[PDB]
Amino acid sequence: TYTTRQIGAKNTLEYKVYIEKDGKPVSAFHDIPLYADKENNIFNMVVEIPRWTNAKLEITKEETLNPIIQDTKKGKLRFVRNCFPHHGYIHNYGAFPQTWEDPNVSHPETKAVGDNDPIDVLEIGETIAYTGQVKQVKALGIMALLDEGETDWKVIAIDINDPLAPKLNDIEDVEKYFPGLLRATNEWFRIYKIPDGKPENQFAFSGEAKNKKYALDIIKETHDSWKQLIAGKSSDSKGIDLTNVTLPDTPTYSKAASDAIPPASLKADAPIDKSIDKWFF
Amino acid sequence: TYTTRQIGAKNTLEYKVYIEKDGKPVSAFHDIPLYADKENNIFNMVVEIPRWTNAKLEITKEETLNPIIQDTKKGKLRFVRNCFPHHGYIHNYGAFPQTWEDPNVSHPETKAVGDNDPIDVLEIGETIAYTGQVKQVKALGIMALLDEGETDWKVIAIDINDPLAPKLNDIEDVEKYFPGLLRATNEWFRIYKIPDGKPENQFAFSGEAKNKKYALDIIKETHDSWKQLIAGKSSDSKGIDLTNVTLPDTPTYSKAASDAIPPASLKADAPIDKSIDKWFF
Ligand SMILES: [Mg+2]
Ligand SMILES: [Mg+2]
């Protein structure tokens, strides 16, 4: 829950980042506890995408110890384009470890199934995060995007160490201290696929971020799903590598998995094509 | 007009960038032709600040051969803060060489003396520029900014090599192809110093972007002020270093002034303080 090890040059198909715990690589999906402090609901967020970058990085469910790598489609590295007035991602974008949005399970208020991923976390503080960072955040609220039959929750969160953190407890405080960030968020998730020849995205609750308690209910839900997933009790974990090195009674415990990870690579960031500079109106 | 000579590391007090012609330093103020093609009105832009950066890099008017050095406040490096929804500068930001906002005379459009700097250029093309870059652009329009009460015109321009350049011929085309950019620009230059405890700036003509003909007219004015300044005929050159290596008919001409510049000593970018990340609202 500690440091990172980067495999490969950044902006490259070889690129992977592992989370290490005291030097040893663990699963970013499995071995990082959801709670840093359960009683107070301080969670561990695994950061994937720094604010104001483009490269579409994610925890790979299908790779052992679930490193963060860059999205590809048909062999090409995937980037989100700049969608005026936005520069790349407008949040530090990440996921809550030890959560899973069960596809074999649906929401009524959001007539839509899980998307088979960890719950997405938008961390809205001032400091730009780094890929593979485990930070402590509090949930402030939650939105619901609606990708094709599956509810895509995005928890809105703030780093516990942020100067403003004490002033922020519920979603209305985001309106108070970050005026327009909720609209920007809304705008961005709707249009950020359009430069990629995809359609406009579609929110539930008509774009409403529901509140902190509403976010807590969903997070604890997706945690319980992941408990049955990691326990081997899931109806269907097609593709998900459940290898972990900290949960000694799980079916898929395997300390040696840690030891099998190659050393930190000595490579400078690959250049990114200048096409990714482009601002799309 | 040609290449770059970097001294030290970016984001560092030691950092300078000289513009070289033929591997040798020339004055970035004086020695780069205003026009790359006067017949077709193609200007040479000197780029100071790439789009989406923060460091307040400036042509140093009072340093010999006028290298680009970062501005400082009470001795500390100056960065422009991020003003939501914007990230750093939203334009490739620079100046036309061989021009001067005359500080000694009240400008009739604005009723303010000039800001004592070359005329500023916002280059709107897709590719992000680099510091010390001389690029060829065409003028599209001009905005009448009173930046802290001084006449501070902003030329709206497009790199001649941009894919959209053939389509972009006047200020109506910017709205056409960059909807909302001009509104965002009016706003950006109003507010970008609020985080510094300075007031909101103002524009003449209610922020109306005047057209190309109006831009050419105002650039000519600033070019003529400069010719007087470089002839040593200004009522007050404000301590500006007028040393140059290409203009033999000026008092301050000196080919060998180029020889006295230290050789390139490029170091990797120094890290920037994390506070410069913050988004102000
Ligand atoms: Mg998701
Ligand atoms: Mg100026």
UniProtKB/Swiss-Prot annotation, chains A, B:
It comes from the Eukaryota. It is an enzyme of class 3 (hydrolase). The modification Phosphothreonine is found at T64, T250. It is found in: Cytoplasm. The active site is at Y89 (proton donor). Keywords: Cytoplasm, Hydrolase, Isopeptide bond, Magnesium, Metal-binding, Phosphoprotein, Ubl conjugation. The keyword Lipoprotein does not apply. GO terms for cellular component: cytoplasm; nucleus. Its EC number is 3.6.1.1. Diphosphate binds at R78. The keyword Phosphoprotein applies. GO terms for biological process: phosphate-containing compound metabolic process. GO terms for molecular function: inorganic diphosphate phosphatase activity; magnesium ion binding. Homodimer. This is Inorganic pyrophosphatase. It comes from Saccharomyces cerevisiae (strain ATCC 204508 / S288c) (Baker's yeast). The gene is IPP1.
